[PDB]
Design a protein around this ligand. Structure first.
Ligand SMILES: CN1CCN(c2ncnc3ccccc23)CC1
Ligand SMILES: CN1CCN(c2ncnc3ccccc23)CC1
Ligand SMILES: CN1CCN(c2ncnc3ccccc23)CC1
Ligand SMILES: [Cu+2]
Ligand SMILES: [Cu+2]
Ligand SMILES: [Zn+2]
Ligand SMILES: [Zn+2]
Lengths: 153, 153
């Protein structure tokens, strides 16, 4: 199996640890972990193109989109490769993450390793918001925490 | 060309931005940038195996060594792929990094993207120290700052 990991940090209180595992190169990636310090509700959760944190999370660029598609949710055919939807936090400030995704990979051209995982301010509308921004960013707003996805033991 | 970047962070602050560029996949990688907050003298500078900073720089594991060789300096045939020698800081605490290396890569089996760059406490003896640890770590000591190497624009 192939494994990867991301430590999410930012300028505020949001922080987390996300793990990735892919049993087979043509198989799904399991994604799990925790993010704390969040406001209650949905927070957009994406892989962005660049593993560049030079100036903070802004440096990561747009959603990872090697197929030049519109933004969507993880269960949509029309999505960016990096579109992992939302994480949802309770009034404890914690989002428990446990998902499986069939479009991201830890090898090949859809590889997310070396790119940035970002948790956002606001909900991602999964491209169903009915405006132009919805099909580019999902209207998820600013970047609260991020990290470069790295190769794990 | 292919480009990568690493934001190094540690207590001091020891911090720096290191850029990587490789004109072709069969060619050398140019490495440049600046690290501040260092004590005067040599500091070991290596790519470590894992891009895991879960518990800090310790989580990055040993030097990146896909070929199962002993530790050396960057000019040695017998070296780890991750062996980039030392950076040298002056009294101002700044090391200017300018390296070209023919063994690291930003693609293929020796790709360093997704792995951790680390700057160390002490000098790397380049495997010439005459003891057991010299040919494993270069006796460079603890890890002052690190970051995951990411894909750049
Ligand atoms: C279920 N999965 C679909 C995505 N998948 C891929 N991984 C890496 N690169 C790819 C390039 C083109 C198409 C699919 C790719 C891995 C397994
Ligand atoms: C192959 N594997 C990858 C997934 N995996 C996990 N390990 C630990 N905690 C988890 C929490 C939620 C979901 C999966 C988890 C271990 C088995
Ligand atoms: C062809 N290239 C243009 C970009 N490039 C550099 N750019 C900016 N500063 C540098 C400082 C020291 C060494 C190389 C540097 C090197 C690769
Ligand atoms: Cu995002
Ligand atoms: Cu090292
Ligand atoms: Zn998207
Ligand atoms: Zn070494």
């Amino acid at each position: 199996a192939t494994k990867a990991v991301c430590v999410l940090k930012g300028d505020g209180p949001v922080q987390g640890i996300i793990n990735f595992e892919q049993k087979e190169s043509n198989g799904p990636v399991k994604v799990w972990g925790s993010i704390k310090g969040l406001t209650e509700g949905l927070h957009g959760f994406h892989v962005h193109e660049f593993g560049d944190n030079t100036a903070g999370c802004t440096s990561a660029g747009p959603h990872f989109n090697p197929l030049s598609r519109k933004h969507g949710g993880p269960k949509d055919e029309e999505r960016h490769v990096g579109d992992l939807g939302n994480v949802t936090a309770d009034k404890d400030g914690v989002a428990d993450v446990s998902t499986e995704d069939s479009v991201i990979s830890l090898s090949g051209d859809h590889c997310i390793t070396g790119r940035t995982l970002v948790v956002h301010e606001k909900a991602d509308d999964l491209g169903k918001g009915g405006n132009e921004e919805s099909t580019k960013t999902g209207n998820a707003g600013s970047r609260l925490a991020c990290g470069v996805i790295g190769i794990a033991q």
